[PDB]
Tab-separated table of C-alpha atoms and ligand atoms in Angstrom:
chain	number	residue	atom	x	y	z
A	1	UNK	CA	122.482	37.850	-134.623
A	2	UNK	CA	118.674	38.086	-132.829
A	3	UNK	CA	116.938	40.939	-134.273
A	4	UNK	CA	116.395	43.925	-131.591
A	5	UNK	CA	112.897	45.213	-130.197
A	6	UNK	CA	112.134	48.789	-130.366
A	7	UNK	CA	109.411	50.104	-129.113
A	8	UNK	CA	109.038	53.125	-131.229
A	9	UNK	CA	105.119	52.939	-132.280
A	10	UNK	CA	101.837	52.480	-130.501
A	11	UNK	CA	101.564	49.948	-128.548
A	12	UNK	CA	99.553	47.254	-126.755
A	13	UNK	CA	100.860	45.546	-123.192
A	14	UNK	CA	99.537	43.155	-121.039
A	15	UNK	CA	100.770	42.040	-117.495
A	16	UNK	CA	100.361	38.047	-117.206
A	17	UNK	CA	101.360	35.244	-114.894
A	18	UNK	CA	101.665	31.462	-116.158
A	19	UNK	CA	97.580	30.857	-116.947
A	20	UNK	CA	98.391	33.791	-119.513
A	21	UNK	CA	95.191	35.597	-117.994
A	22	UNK	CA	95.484	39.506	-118.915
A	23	UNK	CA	95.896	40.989	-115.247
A	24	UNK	CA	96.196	44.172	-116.372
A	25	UNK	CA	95.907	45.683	-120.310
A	26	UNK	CA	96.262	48.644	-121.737
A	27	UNK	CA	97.364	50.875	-125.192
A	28	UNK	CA	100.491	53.784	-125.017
A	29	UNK	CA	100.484	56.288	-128.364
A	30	UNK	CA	101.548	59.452	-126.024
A	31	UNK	CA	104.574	58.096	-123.306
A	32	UNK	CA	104.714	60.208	-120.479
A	33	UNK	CA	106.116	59.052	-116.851
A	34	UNK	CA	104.450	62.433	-114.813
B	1	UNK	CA	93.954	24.149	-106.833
B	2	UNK	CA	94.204	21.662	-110.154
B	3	UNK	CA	91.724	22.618	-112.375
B	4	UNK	CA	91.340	21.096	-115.907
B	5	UNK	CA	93.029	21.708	-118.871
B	6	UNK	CA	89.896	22.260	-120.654
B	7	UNK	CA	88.145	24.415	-118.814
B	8	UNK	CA	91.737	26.667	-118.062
B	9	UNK	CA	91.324	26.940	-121.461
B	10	UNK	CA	87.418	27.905	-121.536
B	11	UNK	CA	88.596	30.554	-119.182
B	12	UNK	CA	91.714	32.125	-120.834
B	13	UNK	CA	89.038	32.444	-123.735
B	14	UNK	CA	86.862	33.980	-121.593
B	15	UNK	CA	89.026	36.398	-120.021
B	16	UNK	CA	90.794	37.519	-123.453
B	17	UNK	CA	87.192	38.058	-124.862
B	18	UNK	CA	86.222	40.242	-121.929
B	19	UNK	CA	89.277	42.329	-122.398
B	20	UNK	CA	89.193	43.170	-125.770
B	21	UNK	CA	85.090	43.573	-125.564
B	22	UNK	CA	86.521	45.802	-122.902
B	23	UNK	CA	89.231	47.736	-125.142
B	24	UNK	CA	86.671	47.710	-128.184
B	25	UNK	CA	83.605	49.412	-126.375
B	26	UNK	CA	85.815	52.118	-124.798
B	27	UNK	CA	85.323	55.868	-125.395
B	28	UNK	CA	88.774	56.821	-124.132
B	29	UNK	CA	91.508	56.511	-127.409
B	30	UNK	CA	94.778	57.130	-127.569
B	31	UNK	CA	96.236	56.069	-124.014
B	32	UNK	CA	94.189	53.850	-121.506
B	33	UNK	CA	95.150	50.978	-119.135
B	34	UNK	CA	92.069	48.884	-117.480
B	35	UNK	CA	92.030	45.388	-115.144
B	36	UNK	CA	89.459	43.641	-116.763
B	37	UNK	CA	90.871	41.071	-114.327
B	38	UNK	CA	89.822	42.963	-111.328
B	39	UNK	CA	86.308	43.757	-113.441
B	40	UNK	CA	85.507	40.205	-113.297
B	41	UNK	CA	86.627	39.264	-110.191
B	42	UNK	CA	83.827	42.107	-108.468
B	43	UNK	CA	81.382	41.454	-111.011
B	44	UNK	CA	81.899	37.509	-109.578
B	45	UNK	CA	80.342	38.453	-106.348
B	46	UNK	CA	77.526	40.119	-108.048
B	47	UNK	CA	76.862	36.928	-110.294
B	48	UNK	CA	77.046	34.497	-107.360
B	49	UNK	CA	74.054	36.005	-105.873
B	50	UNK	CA	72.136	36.398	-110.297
B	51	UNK	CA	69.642	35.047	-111.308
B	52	UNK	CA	67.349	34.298	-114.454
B	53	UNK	CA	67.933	37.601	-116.816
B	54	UNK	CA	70.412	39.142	-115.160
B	55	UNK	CA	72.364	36.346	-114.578
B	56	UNK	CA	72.393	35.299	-118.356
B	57	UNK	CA	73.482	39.051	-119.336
B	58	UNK	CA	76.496	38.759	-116.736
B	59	UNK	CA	77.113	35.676	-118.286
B	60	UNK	CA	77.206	36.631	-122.046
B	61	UNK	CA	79.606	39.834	-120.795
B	62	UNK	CA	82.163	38.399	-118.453
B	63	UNK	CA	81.966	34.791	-119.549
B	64	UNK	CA	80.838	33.248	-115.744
B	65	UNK	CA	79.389	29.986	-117.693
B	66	UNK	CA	82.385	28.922	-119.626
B	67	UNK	CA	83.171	26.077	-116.666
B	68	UNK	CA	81.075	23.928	-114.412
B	69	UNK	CA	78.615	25.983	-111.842
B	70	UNK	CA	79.867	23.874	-109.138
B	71	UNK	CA	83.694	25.091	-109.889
B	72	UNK	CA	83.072	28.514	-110.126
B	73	UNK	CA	83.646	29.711	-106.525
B	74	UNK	CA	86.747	27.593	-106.708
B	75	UNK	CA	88.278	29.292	-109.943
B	76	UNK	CA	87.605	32.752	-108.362
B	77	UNK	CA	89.837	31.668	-105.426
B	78	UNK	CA	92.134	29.957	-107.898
B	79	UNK	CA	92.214	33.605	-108.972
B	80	UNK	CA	92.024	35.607	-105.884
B	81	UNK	CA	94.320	33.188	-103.783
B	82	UNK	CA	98.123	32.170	-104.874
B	83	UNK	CA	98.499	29.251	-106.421
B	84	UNK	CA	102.839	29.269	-107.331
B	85	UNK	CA	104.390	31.136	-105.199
B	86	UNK	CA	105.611	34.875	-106.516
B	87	UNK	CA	108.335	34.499	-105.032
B	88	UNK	CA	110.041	38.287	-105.554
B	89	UNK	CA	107.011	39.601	-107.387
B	90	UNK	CA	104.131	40.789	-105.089
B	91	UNK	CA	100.898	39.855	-106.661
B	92	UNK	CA	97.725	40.866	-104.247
B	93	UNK	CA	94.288	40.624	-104.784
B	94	UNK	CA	91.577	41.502	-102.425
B	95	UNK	CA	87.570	42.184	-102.134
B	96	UNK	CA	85.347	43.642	-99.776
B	97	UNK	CA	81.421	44.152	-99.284
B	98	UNK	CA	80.472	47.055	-97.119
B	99	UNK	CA	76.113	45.540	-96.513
B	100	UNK	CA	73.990	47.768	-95.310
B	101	UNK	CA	72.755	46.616	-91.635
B	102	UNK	CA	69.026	46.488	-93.102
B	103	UNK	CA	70.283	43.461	-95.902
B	104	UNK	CA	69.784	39.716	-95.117
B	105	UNK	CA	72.399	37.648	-97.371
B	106	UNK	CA	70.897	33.969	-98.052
B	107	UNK	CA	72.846	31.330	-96.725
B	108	UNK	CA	74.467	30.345	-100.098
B	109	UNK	CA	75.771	33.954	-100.669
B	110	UNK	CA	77.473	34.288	-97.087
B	111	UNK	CA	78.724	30.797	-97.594
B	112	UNK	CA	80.469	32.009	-100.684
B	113	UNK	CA	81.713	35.474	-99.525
B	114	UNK	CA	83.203	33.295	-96.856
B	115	UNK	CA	84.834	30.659	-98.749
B	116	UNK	CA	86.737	33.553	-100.762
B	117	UNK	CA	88.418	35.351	-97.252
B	118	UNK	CA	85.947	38.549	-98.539
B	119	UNK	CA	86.077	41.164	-96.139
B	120	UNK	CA	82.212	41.863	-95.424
B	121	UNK	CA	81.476	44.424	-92.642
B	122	UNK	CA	77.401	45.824	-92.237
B	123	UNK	CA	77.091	49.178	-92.303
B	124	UNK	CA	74.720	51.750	-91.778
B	125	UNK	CA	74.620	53.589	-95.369
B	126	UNK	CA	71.407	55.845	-94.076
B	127	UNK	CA	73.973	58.196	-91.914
B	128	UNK	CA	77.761	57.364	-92.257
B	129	UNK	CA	77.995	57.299	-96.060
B	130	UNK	CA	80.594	59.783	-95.658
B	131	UNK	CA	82.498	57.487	-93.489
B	132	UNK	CA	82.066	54.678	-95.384
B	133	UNK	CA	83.171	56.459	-98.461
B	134	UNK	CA	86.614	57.293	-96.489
B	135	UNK	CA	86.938	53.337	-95.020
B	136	UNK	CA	86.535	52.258	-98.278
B	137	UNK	CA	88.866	54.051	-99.918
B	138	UNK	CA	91.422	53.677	-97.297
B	139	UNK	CA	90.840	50.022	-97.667
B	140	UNK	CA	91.709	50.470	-101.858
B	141	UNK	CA	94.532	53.006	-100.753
B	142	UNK	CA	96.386	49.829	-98.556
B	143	UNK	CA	95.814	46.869	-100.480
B	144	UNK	CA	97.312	49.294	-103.519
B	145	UNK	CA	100.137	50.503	-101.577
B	146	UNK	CA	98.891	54.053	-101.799
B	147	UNK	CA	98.422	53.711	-105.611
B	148	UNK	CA	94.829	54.278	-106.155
B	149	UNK	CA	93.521	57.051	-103.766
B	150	UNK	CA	90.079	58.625	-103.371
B	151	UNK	CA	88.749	55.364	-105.651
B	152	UNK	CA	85.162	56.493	-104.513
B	153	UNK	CA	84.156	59.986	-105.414
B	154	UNK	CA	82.107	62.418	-103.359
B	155	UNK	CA	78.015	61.140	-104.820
B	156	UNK	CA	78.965	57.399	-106.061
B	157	UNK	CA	77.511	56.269	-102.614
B	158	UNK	CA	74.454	57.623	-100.399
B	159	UNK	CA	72.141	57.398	-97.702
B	160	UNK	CA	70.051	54.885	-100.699
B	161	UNK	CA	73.006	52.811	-101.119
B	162	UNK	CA	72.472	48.680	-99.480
B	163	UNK	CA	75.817	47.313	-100.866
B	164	UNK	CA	79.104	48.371	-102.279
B	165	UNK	CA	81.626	45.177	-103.531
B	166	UNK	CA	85.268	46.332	-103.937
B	167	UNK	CA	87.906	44.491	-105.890
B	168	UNK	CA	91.780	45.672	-105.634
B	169	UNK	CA	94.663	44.349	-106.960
B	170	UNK	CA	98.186	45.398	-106.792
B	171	UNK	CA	101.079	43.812	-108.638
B	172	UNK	CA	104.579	44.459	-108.248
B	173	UNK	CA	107.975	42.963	-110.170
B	174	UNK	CA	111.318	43.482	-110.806
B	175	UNK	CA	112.434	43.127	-114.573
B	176	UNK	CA	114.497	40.043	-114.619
B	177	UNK	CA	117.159	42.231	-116.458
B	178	UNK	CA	116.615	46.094	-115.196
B	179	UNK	CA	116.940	48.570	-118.035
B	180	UNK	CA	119.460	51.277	-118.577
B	181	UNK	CA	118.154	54.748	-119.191
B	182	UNK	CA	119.061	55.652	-122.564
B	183	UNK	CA	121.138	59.372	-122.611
B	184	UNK	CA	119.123	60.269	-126.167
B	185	UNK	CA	115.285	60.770	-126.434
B	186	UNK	CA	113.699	58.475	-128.725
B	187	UNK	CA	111.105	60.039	-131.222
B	188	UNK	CA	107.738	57.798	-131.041
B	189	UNK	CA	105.932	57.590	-134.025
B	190	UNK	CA	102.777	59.916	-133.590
B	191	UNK	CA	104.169	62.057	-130.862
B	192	UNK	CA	107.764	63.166	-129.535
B	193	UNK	CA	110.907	62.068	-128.519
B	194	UNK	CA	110.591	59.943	-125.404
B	195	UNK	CA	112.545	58.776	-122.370
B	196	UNK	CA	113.420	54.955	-123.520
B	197	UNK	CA	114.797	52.467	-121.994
B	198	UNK	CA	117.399	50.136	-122.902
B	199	UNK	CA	119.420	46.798	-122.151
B	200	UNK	CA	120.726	43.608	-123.838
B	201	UNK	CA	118.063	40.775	-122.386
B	202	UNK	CA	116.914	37.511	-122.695
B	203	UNK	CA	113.565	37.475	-123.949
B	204	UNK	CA	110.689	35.717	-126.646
B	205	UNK	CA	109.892	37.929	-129.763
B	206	UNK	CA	107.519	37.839	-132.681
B	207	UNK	CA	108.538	40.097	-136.055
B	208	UNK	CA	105.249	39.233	-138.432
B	209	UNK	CA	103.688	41.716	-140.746
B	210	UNK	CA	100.893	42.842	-138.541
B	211	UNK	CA	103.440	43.142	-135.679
B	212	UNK	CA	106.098	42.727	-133.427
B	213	UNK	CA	105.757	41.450	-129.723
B	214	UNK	CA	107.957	40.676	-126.544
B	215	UNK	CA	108.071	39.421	-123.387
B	216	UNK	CA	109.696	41.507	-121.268
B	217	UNK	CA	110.129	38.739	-118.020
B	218	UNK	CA	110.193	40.062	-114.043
B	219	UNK	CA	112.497	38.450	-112.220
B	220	UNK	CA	111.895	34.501	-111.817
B	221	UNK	CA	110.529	33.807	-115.316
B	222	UNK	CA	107.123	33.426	-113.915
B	223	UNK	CA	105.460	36.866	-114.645
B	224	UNK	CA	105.997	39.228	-118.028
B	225	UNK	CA	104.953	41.962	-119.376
B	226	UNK	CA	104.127	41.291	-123.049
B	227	UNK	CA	104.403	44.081	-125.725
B	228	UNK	CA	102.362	43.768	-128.820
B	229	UNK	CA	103.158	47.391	-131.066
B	230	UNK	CA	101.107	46.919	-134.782
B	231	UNK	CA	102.563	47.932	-137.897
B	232	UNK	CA	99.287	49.525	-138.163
B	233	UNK	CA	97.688	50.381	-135.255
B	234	UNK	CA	94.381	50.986	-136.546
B	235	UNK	CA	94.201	48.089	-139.381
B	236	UNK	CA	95.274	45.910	-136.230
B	237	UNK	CA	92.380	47.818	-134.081
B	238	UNK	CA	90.042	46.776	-137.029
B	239	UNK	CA	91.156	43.193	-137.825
B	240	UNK	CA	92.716	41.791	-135.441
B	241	UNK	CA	92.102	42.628	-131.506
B	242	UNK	CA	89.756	39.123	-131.648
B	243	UNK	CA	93.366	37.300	-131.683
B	244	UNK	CA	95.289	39.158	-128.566
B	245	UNK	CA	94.817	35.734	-126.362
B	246	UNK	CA	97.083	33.573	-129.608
B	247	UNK	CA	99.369	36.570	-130.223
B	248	UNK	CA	99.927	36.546	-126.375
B	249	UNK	CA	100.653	32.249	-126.402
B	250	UNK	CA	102.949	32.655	-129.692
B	251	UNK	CA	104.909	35.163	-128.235
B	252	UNK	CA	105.455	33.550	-124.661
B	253	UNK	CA	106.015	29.963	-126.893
B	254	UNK	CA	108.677	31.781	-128.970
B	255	UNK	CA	112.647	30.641	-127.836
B	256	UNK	CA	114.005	33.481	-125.749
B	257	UNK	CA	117.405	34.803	-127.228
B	258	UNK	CA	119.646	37.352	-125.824
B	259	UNK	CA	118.779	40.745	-128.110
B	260	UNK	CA	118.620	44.489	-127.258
B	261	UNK	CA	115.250	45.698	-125.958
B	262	UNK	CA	114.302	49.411	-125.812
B	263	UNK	CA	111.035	50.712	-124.671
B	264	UNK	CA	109.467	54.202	-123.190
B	265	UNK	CA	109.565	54.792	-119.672
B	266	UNK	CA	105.540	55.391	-118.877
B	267	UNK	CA	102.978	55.679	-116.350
B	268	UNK	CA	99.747	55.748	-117.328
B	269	UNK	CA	96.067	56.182	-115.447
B	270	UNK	CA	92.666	55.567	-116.317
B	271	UNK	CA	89.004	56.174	-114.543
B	272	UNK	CA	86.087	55.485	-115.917
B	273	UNK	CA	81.965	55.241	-114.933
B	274	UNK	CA	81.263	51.909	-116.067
B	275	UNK	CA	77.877	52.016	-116.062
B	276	UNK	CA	77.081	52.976	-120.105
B	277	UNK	CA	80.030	50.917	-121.736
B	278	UNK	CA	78.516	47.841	-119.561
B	279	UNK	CA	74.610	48.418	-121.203
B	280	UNK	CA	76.613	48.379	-124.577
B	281	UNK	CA	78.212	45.243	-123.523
B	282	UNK	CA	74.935	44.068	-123.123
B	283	UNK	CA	74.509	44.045	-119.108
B	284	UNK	CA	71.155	45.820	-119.202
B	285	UNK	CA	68.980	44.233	-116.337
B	286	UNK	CA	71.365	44.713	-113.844
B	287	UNK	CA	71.073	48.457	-113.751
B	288	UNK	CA	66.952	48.724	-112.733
B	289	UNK	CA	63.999	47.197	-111.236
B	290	UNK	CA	64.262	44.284	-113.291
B	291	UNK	CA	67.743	43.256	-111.708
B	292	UNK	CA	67.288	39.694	-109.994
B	293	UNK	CA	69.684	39.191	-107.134
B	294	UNK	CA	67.633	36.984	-105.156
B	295	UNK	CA	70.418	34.418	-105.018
B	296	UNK	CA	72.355	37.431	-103.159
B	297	UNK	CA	69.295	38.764	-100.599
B	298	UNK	CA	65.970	38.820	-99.864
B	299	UNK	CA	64.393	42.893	-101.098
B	300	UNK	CA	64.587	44.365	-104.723
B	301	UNK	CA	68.126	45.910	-105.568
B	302	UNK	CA	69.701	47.117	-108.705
B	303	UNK	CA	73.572	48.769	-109.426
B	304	UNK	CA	73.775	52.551	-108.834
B	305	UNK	CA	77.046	52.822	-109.935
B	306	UNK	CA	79.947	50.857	-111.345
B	307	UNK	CA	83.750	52.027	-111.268
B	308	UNK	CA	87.124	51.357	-112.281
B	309	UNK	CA	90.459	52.552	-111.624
B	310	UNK	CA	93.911	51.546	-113.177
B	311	UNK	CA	97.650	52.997	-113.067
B	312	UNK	CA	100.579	51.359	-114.560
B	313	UNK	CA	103.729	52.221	-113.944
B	314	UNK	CA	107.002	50.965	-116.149
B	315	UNK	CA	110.319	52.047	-115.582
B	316	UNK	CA	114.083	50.908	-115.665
B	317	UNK	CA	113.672	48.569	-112.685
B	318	UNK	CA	110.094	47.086	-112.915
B	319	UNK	CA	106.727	47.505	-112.804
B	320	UNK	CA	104.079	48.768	-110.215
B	321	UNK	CA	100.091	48.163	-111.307
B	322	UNK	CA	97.082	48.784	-109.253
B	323	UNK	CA	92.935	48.344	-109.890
B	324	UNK	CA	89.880	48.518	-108.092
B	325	UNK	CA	86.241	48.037	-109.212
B	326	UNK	CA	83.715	49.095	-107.339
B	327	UNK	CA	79.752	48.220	-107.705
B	328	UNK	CA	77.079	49.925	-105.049
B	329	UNK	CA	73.751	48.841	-105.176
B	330	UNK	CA	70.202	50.610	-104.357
C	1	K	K1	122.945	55.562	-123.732
């Protein structure tokens, strides 16, 4: 069965279209939606 | 709108490298978001009117050189411009140059701003700064939908300032499968339990020892967000940052299978004076009298002041993202 993602650590993201270019970046350690 | 594979290539390099240069000669730690994407993009209309020194240093930082000269205003619309169509996802990228009435562009540089649809209006810096300060950031506040406000703070321009070049973007998407709030908090490792979010999707992952990555698609497969959470953050911070462009290609290559995906709901916002972290990069010339623009217009000018703004906003429906860069000139 596919192993699950949990996003429980710091962490990287990046937002990209199809050319894979890094629109946007950044690094969470503290989430907060405020 | 076809350009080659090579040179997409020399590009994506290019690109990656600027945003981990960007990541690595930060002061700010813990929690930061930046466009490098919109960095470039701004710092492109500086370049296109470099020369000699200062155009090699904007070179070495943002990577200008890695295709032909005579395709470089084309990738920058290939950029700016859509390509695909977004179809549901709102991707919108925009520049303007406020010129002070006093500046005379050479032909190549109008020619350029043209062939990119850049807003230019001329300006009289000497007694509306004010004004100006408030146009501009009106124009940031619309092409963000109200995202980034007051991107120009009281002092960045003055009554000395010639130019100011503004790059925006704003993306929007729908997750291709929207989360589910979960009821329970989720402790993060370093911090607190956290709002997560939750939902059986269809998605590429990576488990390796130095980490674990997703794609986390908007709706039409087109656009993702991609995850990359170390085992060790700062052994990954150490070793292997250099590789983000490969992690990044392995985890979009990776078969998508239907698994559970949870991940905090966050919003996060960044500022910063780019101005040091850019001499550290190694843009030095730019920022005095020895600053040659004299592809851009006849006088002697030099960057005042260079800004950035980011937010990024994730939760159980999608993702809103907004940037501006801003550069004024003396
Ligand atoms: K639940």
């Amino acid at each position: 069965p596919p192993r699950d993602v949990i996003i429980n650590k710091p962490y990287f993201f990046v937002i990209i279209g199809e050319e894979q270019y890094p629109l946007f970046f950044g690094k969470v350690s503290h989430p907060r939606f405020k | 709108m076809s350009m080659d594979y090579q040179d997409i290539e020399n590009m994506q390099i290019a690109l990656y490298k600027l945003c981990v240069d960007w990541y690595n000669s930060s002061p700010i730690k813990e929690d930061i978001v930046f466009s490098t994407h919109s960095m470039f993009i701004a710092f492109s209309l500086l370049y296109i009117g470099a020369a000699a020194e200062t155009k090699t240093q904007l070179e070495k930082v943002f990577g200008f050189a890695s295709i032909p000269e005579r395709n470089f205003i084309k990738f920058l619309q290939s950029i700016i411009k859509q390509q695909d169509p977004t179809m549901s996802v709102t991707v919108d990228i925009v520049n303007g140059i406020w010129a002070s009435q006093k500046l005379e562009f050479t032909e190549e540089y109008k020619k350029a701003i043209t062939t990119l649809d850049c807003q230019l209006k001329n300006v009289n810096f000497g007694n509306d700064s004010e004004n100006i300060r408030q146009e501009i950031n009106k124009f940031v506040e619309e092409a963000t939908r109200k995202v980034i406000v007051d991107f120009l703070q009281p002092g960045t321009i003055s009554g000395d300032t010639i130019a100011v070049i503004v790059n925006a973007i704003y993306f929007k998407g729908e997750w291709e499968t929207p989360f589910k709030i979960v009821q329970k908090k989720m402790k993060f490792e370093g911090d607190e339990e956290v709002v997560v979010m939750k939902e059986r999707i269809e998605c590429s992952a990576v488990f390796t020892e130095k980490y674990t990555s997703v794609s986390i698609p908007y709706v039409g497969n087109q656009y993702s967000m991609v995850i990359i959470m170390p085992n060790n953050m700062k052994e990954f911070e150490k070793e292997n940052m250099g590789e983000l462009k490969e992690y990044v290609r392995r985890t979009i290559q990776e078969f998508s299978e239907k698994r559970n995906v949870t991940i905090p709901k966050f919003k996060i916002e960044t500022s910063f004076s780019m101005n040091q972290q850019l001499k550290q990069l190694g843009l030095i010339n730019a920022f005095d009298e020895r600053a040659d623009f004299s592809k851009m217009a006849k006088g002697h000018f030099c960057v005042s002041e260079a800004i950035h703004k980011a937010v990024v906003e994730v939760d159980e429906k999608g993702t809103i993202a907004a940037a501006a860069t801003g550069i004024a000139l003396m």
